[PDB]
PDB file of C-alpha atoms and ligand atoms in Angstrom:
ATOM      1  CA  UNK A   1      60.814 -15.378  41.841  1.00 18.81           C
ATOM      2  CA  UNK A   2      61.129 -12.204  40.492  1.00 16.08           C
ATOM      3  CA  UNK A   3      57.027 -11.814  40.665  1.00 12.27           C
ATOM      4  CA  UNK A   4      54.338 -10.732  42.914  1.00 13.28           C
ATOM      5  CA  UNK A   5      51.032 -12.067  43.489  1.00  9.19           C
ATOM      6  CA  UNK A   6      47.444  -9.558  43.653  1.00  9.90           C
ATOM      7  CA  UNK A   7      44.771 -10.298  45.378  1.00 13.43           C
ATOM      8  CA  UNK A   8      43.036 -11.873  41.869  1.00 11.89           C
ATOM      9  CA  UNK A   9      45.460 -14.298  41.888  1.00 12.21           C
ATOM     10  CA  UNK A  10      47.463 -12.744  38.921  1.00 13.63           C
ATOM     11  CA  UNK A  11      51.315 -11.730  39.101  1.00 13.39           C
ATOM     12  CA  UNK A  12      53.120  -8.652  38.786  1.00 11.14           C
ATOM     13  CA  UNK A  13      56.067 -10.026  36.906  1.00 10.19           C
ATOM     14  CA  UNK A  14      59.388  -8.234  36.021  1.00 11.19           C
ATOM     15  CA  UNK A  15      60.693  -8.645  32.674  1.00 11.63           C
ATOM     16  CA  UNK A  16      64.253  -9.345  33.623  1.00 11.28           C
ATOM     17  CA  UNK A  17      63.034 -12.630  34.621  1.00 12.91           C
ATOM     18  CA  UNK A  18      64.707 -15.541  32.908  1.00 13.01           C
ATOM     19  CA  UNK A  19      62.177 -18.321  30.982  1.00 14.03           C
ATOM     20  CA  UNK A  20      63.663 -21.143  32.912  1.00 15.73           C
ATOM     21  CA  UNK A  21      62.736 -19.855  36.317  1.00 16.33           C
ATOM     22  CA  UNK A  22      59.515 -18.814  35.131  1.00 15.90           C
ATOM     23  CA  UNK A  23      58.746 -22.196  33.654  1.00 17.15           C
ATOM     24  CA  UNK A  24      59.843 -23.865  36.675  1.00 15.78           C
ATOM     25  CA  UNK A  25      57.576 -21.454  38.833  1.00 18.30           C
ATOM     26  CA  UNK A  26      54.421 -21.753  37.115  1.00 17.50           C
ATOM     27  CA  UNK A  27      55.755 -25.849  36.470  1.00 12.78           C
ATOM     28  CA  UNK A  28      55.904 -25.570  32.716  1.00 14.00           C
ATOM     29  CA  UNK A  29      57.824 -27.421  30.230  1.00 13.78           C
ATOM     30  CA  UNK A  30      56.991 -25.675  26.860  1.00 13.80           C
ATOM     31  CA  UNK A  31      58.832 -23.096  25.389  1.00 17.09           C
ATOM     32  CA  UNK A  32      57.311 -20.072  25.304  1.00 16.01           C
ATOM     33  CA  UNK A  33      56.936 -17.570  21.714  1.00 15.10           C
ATOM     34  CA  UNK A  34      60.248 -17.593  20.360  1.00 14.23           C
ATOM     35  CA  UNK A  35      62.409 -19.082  22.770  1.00 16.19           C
ATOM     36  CA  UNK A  36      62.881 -21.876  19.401  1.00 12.41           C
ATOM     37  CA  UNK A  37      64.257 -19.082  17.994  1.00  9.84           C
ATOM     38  CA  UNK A  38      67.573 -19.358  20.610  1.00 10.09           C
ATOM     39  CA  UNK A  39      67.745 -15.748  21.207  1.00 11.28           C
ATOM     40  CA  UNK A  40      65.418 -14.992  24.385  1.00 12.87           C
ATOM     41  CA  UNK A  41      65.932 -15.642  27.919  1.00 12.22           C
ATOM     42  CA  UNK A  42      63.905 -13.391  29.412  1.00 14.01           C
ATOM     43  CA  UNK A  43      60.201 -12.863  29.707  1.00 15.49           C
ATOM     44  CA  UNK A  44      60.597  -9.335  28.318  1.00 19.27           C
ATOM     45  CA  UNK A  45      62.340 -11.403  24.777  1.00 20.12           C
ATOM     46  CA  UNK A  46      58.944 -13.128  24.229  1.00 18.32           C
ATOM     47  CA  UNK A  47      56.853  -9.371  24.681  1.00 17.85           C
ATOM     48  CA  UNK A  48      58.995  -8.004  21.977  1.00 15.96           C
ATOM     49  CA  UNK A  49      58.779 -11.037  19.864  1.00 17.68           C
ATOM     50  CA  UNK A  50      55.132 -11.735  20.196  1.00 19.74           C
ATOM     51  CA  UNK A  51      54.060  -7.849  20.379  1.00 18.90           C
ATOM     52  CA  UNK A  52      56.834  -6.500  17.949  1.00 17.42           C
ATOM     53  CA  UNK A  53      59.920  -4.098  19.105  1.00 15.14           C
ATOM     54  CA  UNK A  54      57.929  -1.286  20.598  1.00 13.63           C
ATOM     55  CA  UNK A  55      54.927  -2.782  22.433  1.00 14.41           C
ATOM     56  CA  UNK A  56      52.463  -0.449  24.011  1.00 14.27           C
ATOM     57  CA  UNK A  57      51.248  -0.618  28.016  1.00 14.12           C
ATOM     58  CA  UNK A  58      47.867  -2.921  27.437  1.00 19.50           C
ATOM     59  CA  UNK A  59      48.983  -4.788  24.319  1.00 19.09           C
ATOM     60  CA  UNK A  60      48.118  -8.315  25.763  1.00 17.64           C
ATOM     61  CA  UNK A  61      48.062 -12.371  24.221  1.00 17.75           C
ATOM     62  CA  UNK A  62      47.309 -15.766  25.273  1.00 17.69           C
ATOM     63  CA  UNK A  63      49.721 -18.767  25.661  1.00 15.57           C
ATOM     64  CA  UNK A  64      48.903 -21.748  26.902  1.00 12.94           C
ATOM     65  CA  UNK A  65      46.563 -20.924  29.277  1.00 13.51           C
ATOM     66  CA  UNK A  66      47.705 -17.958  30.347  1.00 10.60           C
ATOM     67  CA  UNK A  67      47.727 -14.164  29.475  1.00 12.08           C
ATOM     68  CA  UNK A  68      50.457 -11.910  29.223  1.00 14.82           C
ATOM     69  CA  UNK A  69      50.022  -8.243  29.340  1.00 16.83           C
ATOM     70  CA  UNK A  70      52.330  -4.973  28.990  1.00 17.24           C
ATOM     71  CA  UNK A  71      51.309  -2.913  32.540  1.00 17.70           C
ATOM     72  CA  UNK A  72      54.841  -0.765  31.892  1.00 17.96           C
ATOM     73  CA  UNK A  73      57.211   0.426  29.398  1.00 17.75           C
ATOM     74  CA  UNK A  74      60.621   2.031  30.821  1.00 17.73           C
ATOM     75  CA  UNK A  75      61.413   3.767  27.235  1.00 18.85           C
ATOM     76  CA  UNK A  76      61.941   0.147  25.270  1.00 16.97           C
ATOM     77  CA  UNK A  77      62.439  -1.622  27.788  1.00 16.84           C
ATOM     78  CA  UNK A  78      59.204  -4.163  28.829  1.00 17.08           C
ATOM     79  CA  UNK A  79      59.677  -3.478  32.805  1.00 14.21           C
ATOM     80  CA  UNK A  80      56.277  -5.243  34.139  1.00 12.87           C
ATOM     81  CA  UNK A  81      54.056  -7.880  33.059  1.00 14.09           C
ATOM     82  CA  UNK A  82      50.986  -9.158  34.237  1.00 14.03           C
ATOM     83  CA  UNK A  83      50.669 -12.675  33.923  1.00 12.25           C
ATOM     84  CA  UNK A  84      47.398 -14.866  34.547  1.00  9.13           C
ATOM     85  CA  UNK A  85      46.832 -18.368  34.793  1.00  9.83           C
ATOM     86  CA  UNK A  86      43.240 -19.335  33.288  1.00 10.31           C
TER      87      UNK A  86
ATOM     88  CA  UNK B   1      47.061  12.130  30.530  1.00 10.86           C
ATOM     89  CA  UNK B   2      50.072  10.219  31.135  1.00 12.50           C
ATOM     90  CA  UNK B   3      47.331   6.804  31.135  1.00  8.93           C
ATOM     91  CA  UNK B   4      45.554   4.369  28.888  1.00  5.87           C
ATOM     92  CA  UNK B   5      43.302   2.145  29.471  1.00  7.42           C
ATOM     93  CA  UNK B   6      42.441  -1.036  29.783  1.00  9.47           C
ATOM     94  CA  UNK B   7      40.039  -3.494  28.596  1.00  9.10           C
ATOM     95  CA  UNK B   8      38.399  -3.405  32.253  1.00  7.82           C
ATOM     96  CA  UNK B   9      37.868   0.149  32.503  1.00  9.41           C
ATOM     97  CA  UNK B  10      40.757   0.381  34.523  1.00  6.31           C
ATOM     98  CA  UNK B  11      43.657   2.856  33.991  1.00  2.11           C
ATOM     99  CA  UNK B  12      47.587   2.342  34.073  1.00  3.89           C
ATOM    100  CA  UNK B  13      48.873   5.884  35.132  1.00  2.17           C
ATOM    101  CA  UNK B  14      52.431   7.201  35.591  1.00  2.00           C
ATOM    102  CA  UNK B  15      53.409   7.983  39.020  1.00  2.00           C
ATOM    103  CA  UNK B  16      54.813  11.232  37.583  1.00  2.00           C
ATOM    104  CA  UNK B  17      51.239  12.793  36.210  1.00  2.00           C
ATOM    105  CA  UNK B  18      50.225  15.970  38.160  1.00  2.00           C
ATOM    106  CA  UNK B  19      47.681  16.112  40.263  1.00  2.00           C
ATOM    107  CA  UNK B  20      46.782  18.324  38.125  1.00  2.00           C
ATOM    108  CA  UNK B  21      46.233  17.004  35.421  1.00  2.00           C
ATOM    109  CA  UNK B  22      44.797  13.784  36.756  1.00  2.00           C
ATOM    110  CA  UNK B  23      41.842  15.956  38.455  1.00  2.00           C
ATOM    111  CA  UNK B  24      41.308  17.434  35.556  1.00  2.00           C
ATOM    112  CA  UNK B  25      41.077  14.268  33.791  1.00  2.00           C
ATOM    113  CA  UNK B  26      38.575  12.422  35.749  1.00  2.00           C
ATOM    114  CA  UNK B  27      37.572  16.051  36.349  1.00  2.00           C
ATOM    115  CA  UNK B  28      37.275  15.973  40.214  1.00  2.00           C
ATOM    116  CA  UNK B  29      36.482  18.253  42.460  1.00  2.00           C
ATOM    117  CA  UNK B  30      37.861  16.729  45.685  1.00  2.00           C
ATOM    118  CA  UNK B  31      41.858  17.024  46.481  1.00  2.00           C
ATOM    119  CA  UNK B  32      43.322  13.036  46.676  1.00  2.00           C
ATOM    120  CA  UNK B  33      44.655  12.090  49.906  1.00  2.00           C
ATOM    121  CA  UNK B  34      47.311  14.792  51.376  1.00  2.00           C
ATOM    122  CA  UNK B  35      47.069  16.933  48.475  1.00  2.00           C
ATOM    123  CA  UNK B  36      45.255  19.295  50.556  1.00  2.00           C
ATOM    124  CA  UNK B  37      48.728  20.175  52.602  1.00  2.00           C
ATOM    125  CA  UNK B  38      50.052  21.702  50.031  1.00  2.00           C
ATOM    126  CA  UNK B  39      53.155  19.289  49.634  1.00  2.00           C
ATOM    127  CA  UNK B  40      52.036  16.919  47.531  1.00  2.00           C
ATOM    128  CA  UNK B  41      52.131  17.307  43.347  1.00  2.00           C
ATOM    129  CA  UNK B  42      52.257  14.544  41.656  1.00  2.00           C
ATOM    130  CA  UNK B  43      50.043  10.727  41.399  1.00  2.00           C
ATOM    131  CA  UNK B  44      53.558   9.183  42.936  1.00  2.00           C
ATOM    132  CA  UNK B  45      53.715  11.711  46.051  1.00  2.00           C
ATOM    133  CA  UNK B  46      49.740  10.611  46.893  1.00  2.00           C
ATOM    134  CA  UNK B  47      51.290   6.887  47.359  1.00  2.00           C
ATOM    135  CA  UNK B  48      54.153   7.812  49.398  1.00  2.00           C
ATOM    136  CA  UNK B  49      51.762   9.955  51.416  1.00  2.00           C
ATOM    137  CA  UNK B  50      49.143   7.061  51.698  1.00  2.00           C
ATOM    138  CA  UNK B  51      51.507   3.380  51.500  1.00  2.00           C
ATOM    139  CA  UNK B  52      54.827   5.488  53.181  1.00  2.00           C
ATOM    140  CA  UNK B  53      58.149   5.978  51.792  1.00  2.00           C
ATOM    141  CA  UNK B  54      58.738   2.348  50.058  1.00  2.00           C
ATOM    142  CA  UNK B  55      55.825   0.718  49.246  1.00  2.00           C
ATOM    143  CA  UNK B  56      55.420  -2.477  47.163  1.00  2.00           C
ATOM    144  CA  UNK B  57      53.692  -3.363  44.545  1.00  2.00           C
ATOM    145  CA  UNK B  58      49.945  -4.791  45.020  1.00  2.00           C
ATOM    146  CA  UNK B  59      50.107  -2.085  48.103  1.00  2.00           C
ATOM    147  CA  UNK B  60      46.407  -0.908  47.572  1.00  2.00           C
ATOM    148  CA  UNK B  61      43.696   1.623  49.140  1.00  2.00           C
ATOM    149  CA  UNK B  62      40.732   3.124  47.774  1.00  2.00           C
ATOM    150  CA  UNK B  63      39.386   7.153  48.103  1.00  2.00           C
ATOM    151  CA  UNK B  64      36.523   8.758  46.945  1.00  2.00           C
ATOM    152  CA  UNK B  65      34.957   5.754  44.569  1.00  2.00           C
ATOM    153  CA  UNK B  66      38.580   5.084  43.388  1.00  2.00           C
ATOM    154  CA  UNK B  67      41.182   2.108  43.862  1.00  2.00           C
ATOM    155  CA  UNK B  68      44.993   2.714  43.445  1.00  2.00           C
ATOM    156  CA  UNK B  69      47.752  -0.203  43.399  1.00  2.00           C
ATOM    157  CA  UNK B  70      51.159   0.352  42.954  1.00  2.00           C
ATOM    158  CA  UNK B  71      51.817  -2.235  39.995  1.00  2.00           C
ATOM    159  CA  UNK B  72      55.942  -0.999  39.405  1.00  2.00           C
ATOM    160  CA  UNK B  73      58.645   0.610  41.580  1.00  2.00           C
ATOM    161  CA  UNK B  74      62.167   1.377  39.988  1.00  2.00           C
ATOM    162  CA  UNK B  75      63.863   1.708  43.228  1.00  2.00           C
ATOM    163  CA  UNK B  76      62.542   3.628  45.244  1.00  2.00           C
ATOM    164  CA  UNK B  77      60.445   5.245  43.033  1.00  2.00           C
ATOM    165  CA  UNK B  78      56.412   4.741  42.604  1.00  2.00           C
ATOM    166  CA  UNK B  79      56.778   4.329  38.811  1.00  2.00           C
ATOM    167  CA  UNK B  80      53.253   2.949  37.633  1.00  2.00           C
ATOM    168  CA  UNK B  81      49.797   2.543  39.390  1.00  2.00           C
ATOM    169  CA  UNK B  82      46.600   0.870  38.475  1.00  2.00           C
ATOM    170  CA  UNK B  83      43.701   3.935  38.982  1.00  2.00           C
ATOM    171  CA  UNK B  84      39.988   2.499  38.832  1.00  2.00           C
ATOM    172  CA  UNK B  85      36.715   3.829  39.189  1.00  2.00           C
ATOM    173  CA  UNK B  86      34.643   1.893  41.483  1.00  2.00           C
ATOM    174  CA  UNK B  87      30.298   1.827  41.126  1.00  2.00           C
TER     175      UNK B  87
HETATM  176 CA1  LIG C   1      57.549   3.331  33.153  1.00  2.00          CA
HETATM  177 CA1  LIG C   2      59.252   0.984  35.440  1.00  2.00          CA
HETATM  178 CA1  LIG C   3      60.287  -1.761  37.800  1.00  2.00          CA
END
């Protein structure tokens, strides 16, 4: 897994890391926002999809239990997220 | 500054911001770890000071009512930390 755990129990994730790996991690079966779509494979695809093309370090949402937030941009590229199971 | 902050209080800071500047943000008076030396300029170069040459993210330590976790590397390179001020 392309992911580290802190000591809260959240993950520094990169956003190279494909959907299918992540779901299988975390033992999800749902897609996550705009996977339907067809176009994303990564968890980066979902940040631009749910936060728009340019998101900003701290822009944050909720999915199915868990919250995804921008910790750092790498010019458009969405290079770490931290993810938190509720 | 080269930070913004989150919804905690806490801060997500380029390793790349002077020391500087960060000092003058937070305006403190006391040099961060190793800055005192003289060879250390930048948020990044305190890590590498404190954690060593490649640390990894979650690597952690606390100074002066502050904590400081590496939360990216891009290589070798301490690329974003997590500054917070501590009661
Ligand atoms: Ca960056
Ligand atoms: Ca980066
Ligand atoms: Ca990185």
């Amino acid at each position: 897994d392309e992911i580290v755990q802190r000591e809260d129990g959240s993950w520094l994730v990169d956003g190279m890391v494909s959907l299918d790996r992540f779901r299988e991690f975390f033992e999800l079966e749902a897609p996550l926002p705009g996977e339907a779509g067809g176009n994303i494979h990564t968890l980066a695809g979902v940040m631009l999809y749910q936060l728009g093309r340019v998101p900003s370090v701290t822009d944050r949402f909720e999915w199915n239990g868990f919250s995804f937030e921008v910790v750092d941009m790498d010019r458009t590229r969405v290079d770490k997220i931290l993810v938190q199971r509720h």
